[PDB]
Design a protein around this ligand. Structure first.
Ligand SMILES: CC(C)c1onc(C[S@@H](O)c2c(Cl)cccc2Cl)c1COc1ccc(/C=C/c2cccc(C(=O)O)c2)c(Cl)c1
Lengths: 227, 11
């Protein structure tokens, strides 16, 4: 059973999570537009848009705004790519504005390595197989965003105090909405680490793209520190 | 450094 002081948290987070959707104008390009250059450019347009979503979400995460201004940036930079993996996963696993088939085909043909694309979809399947709830997507995202063990975090203790309550709620739901299998809570947290493997790759990939004269936006150059 | 994320965090 969930407490009323926990109950306020979940509603707040689910409310924050639902309070931002991706513009049709951007997602319409998955349908309408033509090339490997185009497919890449579209993905870039959604990456940029999702950084803003993430920021607006993160601001509404309870207790975030009190954190050290220099820690707040570190938490966003270190978590961006991961949150984007989850959002895509949610879309492909659940969507009307997703266009699963088209979008997948565009991703596949963007001049991006299979070394990276192959595991990406292996991940999407597996996280879809978990038959994950919109609460479980929304809470895991916050948890990821507020991961204390990011690089360049000054005051790691202060993050843990914000993260742990969100884990404690999640463990409650894994027993409530998933009583048969108790390992369900630990299946969710296995992702947190698999999602971390994709960070490591992403920096290597990012270089690959840069040297191929790939152009990115001022917000993505900032979030990933492109010179 | 990081003018934009700040701007977005303070809007
Ligand atoms: C510069 C470009 C190529 C890039 O650089 N890094 C990444 C993130 S990675 O993990 C990735 C790749 Cl390389 C390809 C496809 C997906 C992802 Cl996550 C990306 C692409 O990032 C994306 C791509 C697609 C998406 C799709 C998002 C989406 C879809 C439907 C609906 C909604 C909604 O909010 O309503 C959101 C995102 Cl968020 C991020």
């Amino acid at each position: 059973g969930s407490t009323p002081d926990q109950q306020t948290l979940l509603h707040f987070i689910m409310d924050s999570y639902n309070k931002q959707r991706m513009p049709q104008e951007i997602t319409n390009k998955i349908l309408k537009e033509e090339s490997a250059e185009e497919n890449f450019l579209i993905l870039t347009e959604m990456a940029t848009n999702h950084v803003q979503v993430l920021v607006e979400f993160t601001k509404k995460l309870p207790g975030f705004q009190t954190l050290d201004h220099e820690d707040q940036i570190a938490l966003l930079k270190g978590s961006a790519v991961e949150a984007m993996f989850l959002r895509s996963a949610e879309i492909f696993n659940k969507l009307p504005s997703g266009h699963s088939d088209l979008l997948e085909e565009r991703i596949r043909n963007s001049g991006i390595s299979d070394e990276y694309i192959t595991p990406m979809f292996s991940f999407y399947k597996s996280i879809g197989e978990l038959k994950m709830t919109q609460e479980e997507y929304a809470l895991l995202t916050a948890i990821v965003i507020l991961s204390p063990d990011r690089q360049y975090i000054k005051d790691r203790e202060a993050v843990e105090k914000l993260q742990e309550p969100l884990l404690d709620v999640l463990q409650k739901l894994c027993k409530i909405h998933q009583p048969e299998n108790p390992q369900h809570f630990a299946e969710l947290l296995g992702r947190l680490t698999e999602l971390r493997t994709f960070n490591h790759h992403h920096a290597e990939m990012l270089m690959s793209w840069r040297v191929n004269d790939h152009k990115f936006t001022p917000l993505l150059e900032e979030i990933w520190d492109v010179q | 450094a990081h003018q934009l994320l700040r701007y977005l965090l303070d809007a």
